[PDB]
Design a binder for this molecule. Structure first.
Ligand SMILES: NC(=O)c1ccc[n+]([C@@H]2O[C@H](COP(=O)([O-])OP(=O)(O)OC[C@H]3O[C@@H](n4cnc5c(N)ncnc54)[C@H](OP(=O)(O)O)[C@@H]3O)[C@@H](O)[C@H]2O)c1
Ligand SMILES: CCCCCc1nc(N)nc(N)c1OCCCOc1ccccc1CCC(=O)O
Length: 163
């Protein structure tokens, strides 16, 4: 099982200026609950984007997809392709692809699940933004209710499975 997991604004922005252009603690807790104890696969730019306290993501096997020989920042297992990231895999569990946009594009043809957090923040896309992948007719989804963050932002979760 290969799952994509991401958070996006309603406009579809996932990344800006090498980070995430909102703060939503409830999404971080959701992300930890779904990924804890599993392999997480990410692109190298996302790896370098992690604050030092969160790199590597604790309690998870951190796999970084890169064309380089290796990385200056410690804690990852490097691979040269998504296929190398995905095999071998954890039994009875999902391998989670955790971004960014380039790695989501590579993984989308292979995924069987997407777990999306939608954040109701008004962020008109800017020229260099990373955007969420668009799901085609092979996906069926369900959506949770709108929730209110302690910070006041509305947010909700959507879950998609491959038909
Ligand atoms: N909102 C969310 O849920 C979420 C989640 C994750 C990330 N983000 C944001 O997304 C942005 C980063 O996304 P991004 O698309 O710019 O970068 P990315 O997908 O994280 O990483 C891109 C890098 O992955 C490597 N790569 C890409 N395709 C490859 C291939 N076919 N084979 C081998 N290596 C390959 C390359 O590393 P090398 O250059 O080292 O070769 C490339 O520079 C940041 O703003 C981050 O904060 C948001
Ligand atoms: C602060 C928002 C964190 C979740 C964003 C997110 N939210 C969802 N729903 N899906 C994602 N793929 C994602 O991105 C993960 C990579 C970025 O992680 C980061 C970044 C910076 C600080 C901390 C972490 C994770 C720490 C941990 O899991 O212990």
């Amino acid at each position: 099982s290969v799952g994509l997991i991401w958070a996006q604004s309603t406009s579809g922005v996932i990344g800006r200026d090498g980070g995430i252009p909102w703060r939503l603690p409830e999404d971080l807790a959701h992300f930890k609950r779904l990924t804890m104890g599993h392999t997480v696969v990410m692109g190298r730019r996302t790896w370098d984007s992690l604050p030092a306290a969160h790199r590597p993501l604790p309690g998870r096997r951190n796999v970084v997809v890169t064309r380089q020989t290796g990385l200056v920042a410690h804690g990852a297992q490097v691979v040269g392709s998504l296929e190398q990231a995905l095999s071998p895999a954890e039994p009875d569990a999902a391998t989670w692809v955790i971004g960014g946009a380039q790695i989501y594009a590579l993984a989308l043809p292979l995924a069987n699940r997407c777990e999306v957090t939608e954040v109701d923040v008004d962020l008109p896309p800017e020229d260099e933004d990373a955007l969420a992948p668009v799901l085609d007719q092979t996906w069926a989804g369900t959506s949770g209710e709108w929730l209110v963050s302690r910070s006041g932002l509305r947010y909700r979760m959507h879950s998609y499975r491959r038909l």
